[PDB]
């Protein structure tokens, strides 16, 4: 059965989405960055997140398949997203939905 790490705007599983199911395979490691649209994504920053994920699974993982490890990966991605969202690549969506600043309020960098 699945072994997942469901934070906000990072959901990681251990199967292969065929049409909307997941089908745990033990080796596919899907990802679902920001489903709820807390952030407005570009084509570049999202690729940076993708590459971080790829070089964070393969480059440093050779131990068991616990939820501990996937949760650690999700934490590293959710900190990388802070970095992208502070530096100013991506930003909040502003839409008339919730607008809760889960990551941070806007600063000015004095």
């Amino acid at each position: 059965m699945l072994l997942k790490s469901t934070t906000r705007h990072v959901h990681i599983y251990a199967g292969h989405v065929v049409d909307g199911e997941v089908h745990p395979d033990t080796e596919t490691l899907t990802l679902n960055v920001d489903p709820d649209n807390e952030l407005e994504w570009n084509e570049a920053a999202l690729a940076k997140v993708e590459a971080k994920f790829r070089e964070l699974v393969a480059n440093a993982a050779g131990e068991d398949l616990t939820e501990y490890n996937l949760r650690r990966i999700g934490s590293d991605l959710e900190h990388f997203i802070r970095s992208l969202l502070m530096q100013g690549e991506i930003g909040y969506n502003l839409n008339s939905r919730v607008r809760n600043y889960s990551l941070g309020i806007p600063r000015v960098n004095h």
């Binding site: 059965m1 997942k4 469901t6 934070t7 906000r8 959901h11 292969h16 989405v17 033990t26 080796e27 596919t28 490691l29 899907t30 990802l31 679902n32 960055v33 920001d34 489903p35 709820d36 649209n37 807390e38 407005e40 994504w41 999202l46 993708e50 994920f53 790829r54 699974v57 393969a58 993982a61 050779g62 131990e63 068991d64 398949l65 616990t66 490890n69 949760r71 959710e78 969202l85 502070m86 530096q87 100013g88 991506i90 930003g91 909040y92 969506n93 502003l94 839409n95 008339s96 939905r97 919730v98 809760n100 600043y101 889960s102 941070g104 309020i105 806007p106 600063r107 000015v108 960098n109």
Partner: protein, 206 residues
């Protein structure tokens, strides 16, 4: 690096409607989903006991139409009631996401919007449910007066009315998804039955 955590400056703004026959029907739509919010009995700590006292007869919440419901699928609201440890959190995302789309959230307590007292020197608490699901209304206070929950529901009801019917595009999920082969040596599940049928309980060793 000039305005950190910025706003995105959208375009193609919203293309709202203006005719009266549709906006009155929108008012009926919102009033209907409004005045019959059906919560989910989700209890983890004393916030649930105040929610239970809210069920009671000193002051119910059956009026303005709330039925405490037991399953997520029939439900419309998670009044998040208690602390969210790091071992029950997926058992909350799997209750939230496993629910129909026009659904709302209330975060009662301080142990579930910043971790409260357990926001420091704790190693198993989630310091805010707003980093698990999109909280829609916040009310503070470890155990709050359960009539304050009805203030939060007043404040949530005047936000359901703030919605529009040609605006349900901000209600689905985009699923920006990927795949990655790996090598992490799967282990067997050590979480089964076998509490008394295990050989070691019926076996004083040598």
């Amino acid at each position: 690096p000039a305005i950190l955590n910025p706003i995105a400056r959208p375009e193609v703004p919203q293309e709202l409607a203006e005719n009266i026959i549709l906006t009155s029907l929108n008012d009926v739509y919102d009033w209907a989903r409004l005045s019959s919010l059906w919560p989910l009995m989700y209890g983890t700590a004393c916030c649930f006991i105040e929610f239970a006292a809210m069920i009671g007869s000193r002051f119910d919440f059956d009026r303005f139409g709330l039925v405490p419901r037991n399953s997520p699928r029939q439900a419309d609201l998670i009044i998040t009631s208690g602390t969210i440890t790091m071992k029950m959190a997926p058992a909350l995302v799997r209750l939230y996401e496993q629910m129909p789309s026009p659904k709302y959230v209330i975060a009662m307590g301080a142990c579930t919007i910043t971790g409260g007292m357990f926001s420091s020197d704790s190693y198993s608490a989630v310091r805010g449910v707003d980093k698990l699901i999109p909280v829609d209304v916040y009310l503070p206070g470890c155990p709050p007066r359960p009539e304050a929950i009805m203030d939060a529901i007043v404040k949530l009801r005047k936000k359901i009315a703030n919605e529009h019917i040609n605006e349900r595009g901000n209600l689905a999920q985009t699923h920006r998804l990927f795949t990655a082969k790996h090598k992490m040596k799967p282990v067997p599940p050590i979480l089964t039955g076998q509490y008394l049928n295990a050989p070691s309980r019926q076996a004083p060793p040598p």
